[PDB]
Enzyme design. Structure first.
Site, short mmCIF file in Angstrom:
data_model
loop_
_atom_site.label_atom_id
_atom_site.label_comp_id
_atom_site.label_asym_id
_atom_site.label_seq_id
_atom_site.Cartn_x
_atom_site.Cartn_y
_atom_site.Cartn_z
N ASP A 239 33.23 49.49 -40.34
CA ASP A 239 34.22 48.37 -40.33
C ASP A 239 33.62 47.31 -41.25
OD1 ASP A 239 36.21 46.13 -39.00
OD2 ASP A 239 34.13 45.50 -38.55
N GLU B 273 33.27 44.03 -43.98
CA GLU B 273 33.54 42.61 -44.20
C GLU B 273 33.52 42.36 -45.72
OE1 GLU B 273 33.55 41.56 -40.73
OE2 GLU B 273 32.59 43.49 -40.32
N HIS C 38 33.63 34.71 -40.36
CA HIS C 38 32.20 35.01 -40.60
C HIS C 38 31.40 33.90 -41.32
CE1 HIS C 38 34.11 36.10 -44.29
NE2 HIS C 38 34.48 37.30 -43.88
N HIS D 265 30.92 38.74 -36.45
CA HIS D 265 31.95 39.69 -36.19
C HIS D 265 32.02 40.71 -37.30
CE1 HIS D 265 34.15 39.90 -32.58
NE2 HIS D 265 35.25 40.35 -33.17
N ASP E 281 27.96 45.53 -36.04
CA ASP E 281 28.87 46.47 -35.40
C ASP E 281 28.56 47.89 -35.72
OD1 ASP E 281 30.36 44.26 -34.29
OD2 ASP E 281 31.92 44.61 -35.71
#
Lengths: 366, 229, 927, 56, 366
Positions: free
Chosen positions: B6, B8, B60, B156, B161
């Site tokens: 995932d 960013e 973020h 996040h 993650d």
DNA sequence: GGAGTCCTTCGTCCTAGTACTA
DNA sequence: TAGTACTAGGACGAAGT
């Protein structure tokens, strides 16, 4: 730091410090143990912000002093699981405590000792000692009369009142009252003070089965109890409480005795058909006899009749039977005596063997 | 060997093509082998080709200038494609990544194909939706469900993650497998084709007359009746 | 005949609201496009679209065939949930059907839906035709179990009580157990000699609507597409397969198809629609006719004495009223509506006798002097020539729209009184299905398909607030729709499907939007649906449909405004005894007060109804209306037409002598139209003026006047042309110039499109005047009432205070001790908050507070408050608002110290309250 | 591995860069406290090389 | 209506018939106990809407039929509350039940017998005897595997299969399971009954541990069971218990032995430092050894080193500690032998002295 | 046949009511 | 003989950057 300890010495302390810990206490650090090696001993601690338990224990094997914070609940449960006579290997190095025991191996969440709320040092005001077994009497004779939650904070805990050579205690919620006292054999100053519910739970907890001397020292606003190597600390509260001599009915004129066990079994029986929330009943009394009846909204109806020693006319009155059954459990006797005024005033009771715990409980308006 | 991400980036387009005018910046490259955490990341970063989107910043708080001089997508396209080749791609927010992956592969202009031709494309949310229909199937939601620490981890997404999502993935697939009972799962498409004496119950002459009169009413009130046509 | 031997016999419209799709008319248009002469609609446990069904059958030359599916309980399967599909042969069955439905709803139900007892087939027996229930019937469940004794017990019942009126439902749509059921049912068909009939269990037009229907159900159920637990009980093969498709589908089972012919013969139900079913008991000891005439003359007497307290002027002005009286009387009697009025007028009187101020609508009922005389309307129609033949036209013997609504404030009271009067089951309320907004349909599709909350809501929040918004409209109004269409493949699939979903009924009408009455049980003519307890019955037909079925309507309008008035009146008339100011009747206000007009001129008109718009407040400022007729005009003014024809500025100029008054136009004018156009200063405004001037200028009938106005609403070329000729020779007949008359007729046509209903405007303008009077005459006192009205809206509340402030109206912060339910003014204490003015709080808590305050005096502190009232009524959340607000301020001095003892106070209440409740005293004393 | 902590400080000090497009929220004073000593040196220079370049 | 019974004769029947009670019974008279004198015996009845418990007690004094149903827990406690050898005399006077004991008196809320449903007598299919003791171990050995709340309702209960000359029972969660087989000495026809968890709870409680032999009759969808003086009756859930032979593991080729107490101890210890819900523990087996660990969310780590006899292939496997502890707590025996197939199959678990039983969890791969 | 009208979704956090086990 | 866990019901905010 490093240490080594002998399961059986330390297991009982572990249970002592382990009991109070709430399912979830307020501040996560309170979920972990105080482990400080100072001099030649470890002190283990858990707090709720109002109470504290300490056990001091001799380390027979090599060690170096230090400080840490390690998970309490689960630790004790693990130590329940340990084999008889267990040799344990534990060591501080920086921000890890390594826990081994025998050939088992563990790695822990670890916080510094300083992140745990280090409770307050204070100066002794009055000091004294007593047998454990007398205290259990005092406690168990009185403990259940405390409310579960009274915001008149001076209700939720146990009152200790020291004057002359006697120490006198009492618990109540407006609806029951129970007192218990024994003399201490020393002339004291005056200090009177009431302990928090959870404080008194822990005090009970540390009354292990031994005749070993129990010592407690009170400060101006905090209290400490030594029973040998089992150690108690709790702060106290300002605790303005009423004068129990205004709460005592002075002389209720008519007197009544009855056999405890007969009484108790009959109560047990009759009690079941009172509404469980109100515990409602009517007691009718006559010479040499008592007649007990009840009914509830469910329209169940009760009657028990029995042998009581009573001189005088009829009386009509009703109570919470839980309250009295609790005294009857505590009441270690054949004969008890009630000394009565009327349905709108106190009823005083005294054990025909106790003469130390007398009881005054409020009835209903019917 | 099973590999996920995932990611960013330089923020998002909220409408339509959520990817339009954006390029990928961040690489935490998860190696998870036999559902065990290797942590075998190739850790260097990519070219933003643009300034930070305000939305992305607030999520973020990252800013452009750290990631600018670090080499572009083209320099480690092949390095990183070899890192992902021949694998199971179970991924959260599939529409985002797959969109980017395939798209970036073609953007190299070495005719390198879309990822779904050489890798198994699986959405993790599809499986989460299957397991928990009508429950929140988010990272933080299921994080709290499976009791993993993202309270002491403020980021996040991806540099955290990776690790966490592995643990989540494991939980979902490592939830607990099932006792082979005999069970028959509904949606088998069949037709009987038979003949044998049965009774036909007909309407009476009067019933027919009631109908003929009813159709009078249809026709005369409506201006036509298709039974009477 | 030439071709048809088939109709589908199990078919549902979307109006069931657990099943079905799209609309019934499109379903019917397809049946017709399939060359069908007839067709059965069997909506689930209702025939709500029967109105539309009849409309479509009648219109397309299709026979409507009547039926439905149900929820069955025989005691042999217990509460195992099954269908029965039940069809009526004739009038008898129709009645029984309607009664069965109503009885299921009367019983009450939960999420499973209304359920019927099998033994209600005792009563509801004669004239009906019945099915096996299909695959999932009582018969089907018992057949699938394969217990032949259980089977025999069930069938026996239906073979006994419904001989030759029982056919078997068959379904082969590629679903589980269709083979098994069918196979076992064909064995039972041989074995019992019962007739078999084939259906396709149809729910939709095209096979691609499968997905949509699946989602329809799932919308109710509240589950996601890929959830295995979600019921997937339907297949895509359930559409209108053609004649020949069905012929070969069941070329293995001949009797099934032939039994469609048979069933079609049997099913012929007559319900008359579009002309009235009499809803009237005789109200007093008299003839129907005579009671009307009597109460008209006696209603007139009140108005007369009120309007003309000078007896000289009463006699002079009297003739016009007697003449109008009799004119209206004649038309009402000749058309046969007097029953309606008797009910209503008795009802209106009754609501005045009780504490029910009169609901805001009258429609265009101010056109009737009779309505006015009977106190059905509020102000004087003959003062201003307000016109009946809009309200009922004699040469249009069709809809007589009485156009009445009533006030929410007293709703249950009214419903109840009319149930006491007619019989609870002779009467019912109406579906108000919550209108499926573009918002809703999108929202619901999206979540069901498993798009995120954010994805789908990003689409729907772009759509304008319009109630009639569609996807066709959405694409043209917002460029972001074409954009996301082209930029998301899953949105394409969504919108193709959402075009079929757009505007479908969402679910049951939560609560009514009106009421109806029959001569006998209402259920003798229309069906019901009822609330979650099976109570508060609502008609299965909506507004349009129910009245097109010939039955009586009264719409909703909950104007919180009448409640205002009511409440303001009560509180003003408390100021009676306080300062000898007499009882005030809103009907009895003076109509010439200049304080009122002064304050109006200052544009301080917020929360005066329909003067809520910003533009409208700007318009008041510019308009400077100085008589009542200008005020009636204001609603007709603030609209797209008048503002975009310069009409506002024309009227403004023409009003003050900036532009010349003409009757009506600068070039094309005539002084004989002065009586019509006087109050509007020559400006052509009203529907009333249209018809006045046709009658007055050119010798029209009043009904011919209504015909022209209707024709100008439609804007038809034919309609004009004919009447345009009679309009010319009518002017010529009265000597008025042809060119003048026709060129004014062109102006008429222009303004007829915008031409507003005076009587409808005036009835509502009445109310603005009332809000104005009360405000100005005693506006400060009303202000309380204003704020009462907008309790739930924070925005308005804040606006309203700013309005008080400008007025000089000293608004005080609250006090719990003095506070009433809602706003109060002490004599000196200008203003106090209502207790309801506390932000979040519900009604039970607030009653509690005041009840305790009644028994006790003012509560001495925090402590004394909590003690008096039980914990049920005192929540911490309640009390948290109280601290936050500073409602206590005066008693409980500190900001912070009070929040602390809040827990303590709660606990004291539990401790002191609860002990007193248990009955056991404590021993503390001395505080 | 230890420059991988240090170069994440280059990443955190970039927060203060987006001050130079304050169209949505960026907090200059927060980073003074969050960033401990082993990286203050690299962080303080990072502020200035960042802040001017996030503008352009 | 008349009868006379002694406290001691009422006490144990009353506790046993009081088993089905609880859960705020919806049809109010289900919360009451039925007194019926029928034929030569006093019968009491309590139902939970799914099952019934009947007691037969000796009526030695004169009596007459007549029946009613009085509120259950309260009523049980009254009778339990009376002293040894007490005078219990009850009498139905139509609507009211009058209960007395000597000079004490009890008049109850009374609902008539006919509000209580009497559930249908049914027909027997198979009938048998064995010691209660065998049945106690049988139920106890499988109780824990039944779910408390499952949507697969048929798993909230126990499969009884009688087959050949063996009595063979089995229960499960959908996670874990135990099956057990006992030889009964006579021929049994093939049968299946699936009994709801409430039913088996009741059955467990009626084992007071007597040597009174156990005889039971089972119908197709009902059940009958006789312990000493007492007789139990219940209806069952209608169907859908699958074939247990389907889930049985396919010839586990790997063998694993470790001392049962030791083994049990390590598990208990280890349990405490796992994920609260899921109890995640890790197992790597190798020649002569096993590696035990668990990791939990708080970064805690336990590991136990152990006495493992092991011959077979090396593999990795983890599963829920609670479920396996439940089997270990049931197996108070000499040794556990574990029989493995691979890291992704269900595993078999055994007492090394009884292959009468099998225990099984499938693993989670963590 | 023209025109005017109604409410909202689900999951998690906090406190109180009635059950279970050491 | 005492303490906590689960459910109920409303209040407040929403899958990822």
């Amino acid at each position: 730091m490093k240490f080594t300890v002998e399961r059986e010495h330390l297991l009982k302390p572990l249970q002592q410090v382990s009991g109070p810990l709430g399912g979830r206490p307020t501040l996560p650090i309170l979920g972990n143990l105080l482990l400080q090696v100072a001099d030649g001993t470890l002190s283990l601690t858990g707090t709720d912000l109002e109470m504290e338990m300490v056990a001091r224990v001799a380390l027979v094997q090599p060690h170096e002093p230090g400080a840490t914070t390690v998970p309490a609940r689960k630790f004790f449960d693990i130590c329940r699981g340990l084999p008889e006579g267990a040799e344990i290997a534990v060591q501080l190095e920086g921000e890890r405590m390594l826990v081994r025991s025998g050939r088992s191996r563990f790695s822990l969440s670890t916080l510094p000792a300083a992140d745990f709320p280090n409770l307050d040092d204070w100066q002794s005001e009055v000091e004294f000692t007593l047998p454990q077994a007398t205290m259990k009497r005092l406690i168990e004779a009185t403990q259940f009369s405390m409310a579960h939650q009274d915001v008149r904070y001076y209700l939720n805990g146990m009152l200790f009142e020291t004057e002359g050579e006697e120490l006198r205690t009492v618990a109540t919620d407006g609806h029951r009252l129970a007192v218990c006292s024994m003399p201490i054999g020393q002339s004291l100053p005056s200090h009177s003070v009431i302990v928090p519910r959870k404080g008194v739970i822990e005090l009970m907890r540390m009354l292990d089965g031994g005749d070993n001397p129990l010592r407690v020292q009170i400060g101006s606003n905090n209290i400490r109890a030594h029973v040998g190597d089992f150690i108690f600390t709790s702060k106290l509260v300002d605790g303005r409480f009423p004068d129990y001599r205004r709460v005592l009915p002075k002389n209720p004129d008519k007197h009544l005795e009855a056999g405890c066990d007969l009484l108790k079994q009959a109560f047990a029986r009759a009690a079941i058909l009172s509404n469980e929330k109100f515990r409602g009943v009517r007691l009718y009394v006559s010479e040499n006899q008592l007649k007990i009846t009840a009914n509830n909204p469910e329209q169940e109806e009760a009657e028990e009749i029995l042998d009581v020693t009573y001189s005088g006319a009829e009386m009509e009155i009703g109570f919470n039977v839980s309250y009295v059954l609790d005294v009857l459990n505590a009441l270690k006797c054949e004969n008890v005596r009630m000394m009565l005024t009327d349905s709108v005033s106190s009823v005083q009771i005294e054990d025909a063997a106790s003469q130390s715990a007398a009881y005054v409980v409020m009835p209903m308006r019917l | 060997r099973q590999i996920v991400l995932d990611t960013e980036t330089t923020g998002m387009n909220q409408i339509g093509a959520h990817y339009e005018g954006h390029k990928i910046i961040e690489i935490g490259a998860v190696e998870v082998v036999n559902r065990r955490l290797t942590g075998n990341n190739f850790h260097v970063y990519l070219k933003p080709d643009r300034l930070v989107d305000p939305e992305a910043f607030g999520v973020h708080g990252i800013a452009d200038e750290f990631l600018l001089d670090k080499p572009t997508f083209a320099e480690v396209a092949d390095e990183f494609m070899d890192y992902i080749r021949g694998a199971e791609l179970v991924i959260h927010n599939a529409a985002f990544d797959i969109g980017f992956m395939d798209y970036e592969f073609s953007l190299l202009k070495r005719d390198i194909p879309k990822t779904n031709t050489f890798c198994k494309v699986t959405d993790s949310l599809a499986v989460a939706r299957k397991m928990f229909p009508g429950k929140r199937n988010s990272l933080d939601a299921l994080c709290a469900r499976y009791e993993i620490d993202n309270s002491k981890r403020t980021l996040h997404g991806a540099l955290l993650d990776a690790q966490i999502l592995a643990e989540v993935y494991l939980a979902m697939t490592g939830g607990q497998l099932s006792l082979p009972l005999a069970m028959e799962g509904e949606t088998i498409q069949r037709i009987v084709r038979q003949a044998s004496k049965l009774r036909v119950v007909f309407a009476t002459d009067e019933e027919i007359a009631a109908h003929e009169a009813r159709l009078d009413l249809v026709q005369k009130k409506g201006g036509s009746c298709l039974w009477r046509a | 005949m030439s071709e048809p031997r088939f109709v589908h016999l199990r078919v549902h419209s979307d109006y069931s609201m657990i099943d079905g799709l799209a609309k019934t008319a499109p379903l019917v248009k397809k049946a017709a496009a399939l060359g069908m002469p007839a067709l059965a609609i069997t909506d689930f446990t209702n025939l709500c679209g029967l109105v539309k069904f009849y409309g479509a059958g009648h219109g397309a030359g299709i026979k409507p065939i009547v039926g439905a599916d149900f929820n069955v309980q025989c005691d042999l399967l217990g509460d195992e949930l099954t269908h029965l599909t039940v069809l009526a042969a004739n009038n008898t069955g129709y009645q029984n059907l309607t009664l069965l439905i109503s009885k299921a709803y009367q019983r009450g139900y939960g999420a499973a839906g209304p359920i019927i007892d099998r033994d209600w087939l005792i009563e509801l027996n004669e004239g009906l035709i019945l099915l096996s229930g299909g695959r999932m019937g009582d018969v089907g469940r018992s057949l699938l179990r394969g217990n032949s004794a259980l089977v025999d017990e069930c069938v026996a019942f239906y073979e006994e009580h419904f001989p030759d009126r029982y056919f078997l439902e068959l379904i082969r749509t590629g679903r589980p157990d269709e083979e098994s059921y069918l196979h076992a049912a064909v064995e039972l068909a041989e074995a019992r000699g019962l007739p078999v009939v084939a259906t396709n269990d149809v729910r939709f037009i095209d096979s691609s609507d499968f997905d949509a229907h699946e989602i329809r159900v799932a919308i109710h159920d509240g589950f996601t597409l890929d959830d295995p637990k979600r019921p997937r009980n339907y297949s895509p093969q359930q559409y209108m397969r053609s004649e020949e498709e069905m012929c070969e589908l069941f070329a293995d089972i001949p009797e099934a198809l032939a039994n469609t012919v048979e069933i079609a013969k049997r099913c012929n139900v007559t319900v008359r629609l579009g002309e009235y079913f009499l809803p009237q008991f005789p109200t007093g000891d008299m003839s129907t006719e005579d009671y009307l005439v009597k109460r008209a003359k006696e209603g007139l007497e009140e108005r007369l004495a009120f309007l003309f307290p000078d007896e000289e002027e009463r006699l002079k002005r009297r003739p016009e009223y007697d003449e109008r009286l009799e004119t209206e009387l004649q038309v009402i009697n000749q058309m046969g509506f007097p029953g309606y009025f008797l009910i209503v007028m008795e009802f209106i009187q009754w609501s005045k006798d009780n504490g029910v101020p009169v609901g805001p609508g009258r429609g265009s009922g101010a056109g009737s002097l009779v309505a006015y005389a009977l106190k059905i309307t509020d102000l004087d129609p003959l003062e201003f020539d307000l016109l009946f033949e809009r309200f009922l036209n004699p040469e249009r013997v069709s809809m007589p729209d009485f156009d009445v609504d009533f006030c929410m404030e007293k709703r249950d009271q009214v419903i109840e009184h009319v149930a006491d009067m007619y019989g609870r089951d002779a009467v019912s309320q109406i579906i108000t299905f919550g209108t499926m907004a573009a918002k809703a349909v999108i929202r619901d599709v999206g979540r069901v398909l498993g798009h995120p909350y954010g994805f789908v809501d990003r689409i729907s929040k772009l759509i304008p607030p319009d109630p009639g918004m569609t996807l066709a409209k959405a694409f043209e109004a917002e460029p972001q729709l074409p954009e996301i269409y082209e930029a998301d493949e899953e949105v394409k699939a969504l919108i193709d499907m959402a075009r079929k979903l757009e505007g479908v009924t969402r679910n049951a009408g939560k609560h009514a939007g009106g009421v109806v009455i029959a001569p006998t049980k209402i259920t003798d003519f229309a069906p019901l649906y009822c609330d979650e307890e099976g109570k508060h019955p609502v008609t299965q037909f909506d507004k349009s449909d129910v009245e097109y079925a010939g039955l009586v309507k009264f719409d909703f309008l909950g104007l919180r405004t009448l409640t205002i008035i009511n409440w303001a009146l009560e509180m003003i008339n408390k100021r009676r005894a306080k300062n000898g100011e007499p009882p005030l009747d809103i009907a009895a206000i003076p109509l010439d007060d200049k304080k009122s007009f002064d304050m109006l001129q200052r544009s301080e008109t917020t929360a005066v109804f329909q003067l809520e718009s910003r533009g409208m407040k700007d318009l008041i400022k510019r308009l400077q209306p100085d008589c009542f007729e200008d005020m009636i005009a204001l609603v007709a003014l603030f609209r797209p037409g008048p503002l975009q024809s310069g009409m506002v500025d024309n009227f403004i100029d023409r009003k003050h002598g900036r532009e010349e008054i003409s009757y009506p136009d600068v070039q094309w004018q005539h002084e004989s139209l002065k009586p019509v156009l006087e109050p509007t200063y020559g400006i052509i405004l009203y529907q009333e003026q249209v018809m006045q001037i046709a009658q007055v200028l050119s010798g029209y009938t009043l009904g011919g006047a209504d015909m022209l106005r209707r024709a100008m609403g439609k804007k038809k070329p034919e309609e004009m042309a004919k009447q345009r000729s009679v309009f010319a020779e009518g002017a010529e007949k009265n000597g008025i110039n042809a060119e003048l008359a026709m060129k004014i007729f062109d102006l008429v046509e222009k303004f007829a499109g915008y031409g507003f209903n005076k009587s409808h405007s005036a009835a509502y303008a009445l109310v603005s005047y009332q809000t104005l009077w009360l405000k100005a005459h005693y506006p400060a006192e009303f202000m309380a009432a204003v704020m009462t009205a907008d309790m739930d809206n924070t925005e308005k509340v804040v606006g309203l205070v700013d309005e008080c402030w400008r007025m000089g109206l000293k608004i005080l912060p609250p006090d719990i001790n003095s506070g009433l339910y809602h706003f109060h003014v002490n004599d000196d204490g200008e203003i106090v908050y209502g207790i309801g003015a506390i932000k979040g709080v519900g009604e039970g808590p607030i009653e509690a507070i005041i009840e305790a305050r009644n028994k006790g005096g003012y509560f001495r502190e925090l402590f004394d408050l909590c003690a008096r009232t039980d914990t049920k009524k005192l929540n911490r959340r309640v009390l948290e608002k109280l601290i936050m607000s500073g409602a206590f301020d005066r008693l409980g001095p500190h900001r912070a110290a009070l929040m602390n003892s809040l827990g303590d106070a709660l606990k004291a209440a539990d401790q002191h309250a609860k002990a007193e409740a248990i009955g056991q005293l404590d021993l503390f004393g001395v505080l | 591995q230890t420059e991988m902590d240090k170069v994440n400080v280059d990443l955190a000090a970039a927060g203060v860069a987006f001050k130079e497009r304050y169209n949505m929220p960026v907090i200059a004073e927060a980073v003074e406290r969050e960033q401990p000593e082993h990286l203050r040196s690299w962080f303080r220079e990072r502020l200035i090389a960042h802040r001017l370049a996030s503008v352009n």
